[PDB]
Design an enzyme around this catalytic site. Structure first.
Site, short mmCIF file in Angstrom:
data_model
loop_
_atom_site.label_atom_id
_atom_site.label_comp_id
_atom_site.label_asym_id
_atom_site.label_seq_id
_atom_site.Cartn_x
_atom_site.Cartn_y
_atom_site.Cartn_z
N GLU A 35 97.56 -4.78 73.74
CA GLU A 35 96.29 -4.36 73.74
C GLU A 35 95.26 -4.76 75.07
O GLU A 35 94.54 -3.91 75.43
CB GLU A 35 95.39 -4.63 72.34
CG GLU A 35 95.90 -3.64 71.23
CD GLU A 35 95.84 -2.25 71.21
OE1 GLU A 35 94.92 -1.71 72.00
OE2 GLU A 35 96.37 -1.61 70.24
N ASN A 46 87.78 5.63 75.86
CA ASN A 46 88.58 6.59 75.13
C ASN A 46 88.27 8.10 75.53
O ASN A 46 87.17 8.06 75.98
CB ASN A 46 88.71 6.45 73.59
CG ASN A 46 88.91 5.22 73.25
OD1 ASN A 46 88.44 4.50 72.12
ND2 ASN A 46 90.22 4.66 73.62
N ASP A 48 87.48 10.58 73.85
CA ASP A 48 86.16 11.11 72.87
C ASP A 48 84.86 10.50 73.29
O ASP A 48 84.03 10.95 72.53
CB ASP A 48 86.55 11.19 71.43
CG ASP A 48 86.53 9.77 71.02
OD1 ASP A 48 86.75 8.65 71.74
OD2 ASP A 48 86.37 9.61 69.91
N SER A 50 84.22 7.18 72.99
CA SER A 50 84.13 6.10 72.33
C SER A 50 84.67 4.69 73.55
O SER A 50 85.26 5.19 74.38
CB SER A 50 84.75 5.88 71.15
OG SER A 50 86.03 6.12 71.09
N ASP A 52 86.93 1.04 73.56
CA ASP A 52 87.75 -0.04 72.94
C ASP A 52 87.36 -1.56 73.38
O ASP A 52 87.09 -1.62 74.83
CB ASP A 52 89.40 0.10 73.03
CG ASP A 52 89.69 1.15 72.17
OD1 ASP A 52 89.08 1.69 71.47
OD2 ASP A 52 90.97 1.51 72.47
N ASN A 59 87.50 -0.40 68.27
CA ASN A 59 86.78 0.83 68.85
C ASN A 59 85.66 1.20 68.35
O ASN A 59 85.23 1.21 67.14
CB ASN A 59 87.79 2.12 68.62
CG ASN A 59 87.24 3.32 68.52
OD1 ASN A 59 86.86 4.10 69.44
ND2 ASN A 59 86.88 3.63 67.08
N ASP A 101 92.28 -1.27 55.85
CA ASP A 101 91.73 0.32 55.84
C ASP A 101 92.76 1.37 55.06
O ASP A 101 92.23 2.27 54.59
CB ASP A 101 91.32 0.71 57.13
CG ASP A 101 90.38 1.91 57.13
OD1 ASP A 101 89.61 2.27 56.26
OD2 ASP A 101 90.38 2.68 58.01
#
Ligand SMILES: O=N[O-]
Ligand SMILES: O=N[O-]
Length: 129
Positions: A35, A46, A48, A50, A52, A59, A101
């Protein structure tokens, strides 16, 4: 801060990630490697809009507030900059909420693609744990 391999393993263990939700310590070290390359200051945009953040590339769409991801959530109740500190407490605590989650470690694209089903124990080999 760029962590050493065994240095990060030890910090993650200290923070209670070893076997958290059934994921051995090697899984977390492997994820962090692919990562962020063990770098707490890592950031990636990202598609969209957003971003990280941190060793585990958490995110802003769901987990933190970076003041520039409009209409997103802040489920870990933190500024995204907290995820970039040399102290990994915020990253670890948020990661615990993410992995709980429902999708487990599949939430991390790099883990699914590069760690899952591999000999993850190799990531903690040689470390004084
Ligand atoms: O923490 N050096 O592997
Ligand atoms: O708390 N270890 O960065």
């Amino acid at each position: 801060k760029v962590f050493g391999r065994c240095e990060l393993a030890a910090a993650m263990k200290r923070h209670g990630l070893d076997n958290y939700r059934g994921y051995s310590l090697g899984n977390w070290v492997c994820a962090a490697k692919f990562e962020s390359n063990f770098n707490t200051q890592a950031t990636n945009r990202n598609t969209d809009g957003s971003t990280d953040y941190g060793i585990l590339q958490i995110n802003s769409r769901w987990w933190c507030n970076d003041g520039r991801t409009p209409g997103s959530r802040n489920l870990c109740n933190i500024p995204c900059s907290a995820l970039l500190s040399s102290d990994i407490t915020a990253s670890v605590n948020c990661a615990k909420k993410i992995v709980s989650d429902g999708n487990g470690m599949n939430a991390w694209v790099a883990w699914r693609n590069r760690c899952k089903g591999t000999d993850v124990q190799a990531w903690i080999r040689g470390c004084r744990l």
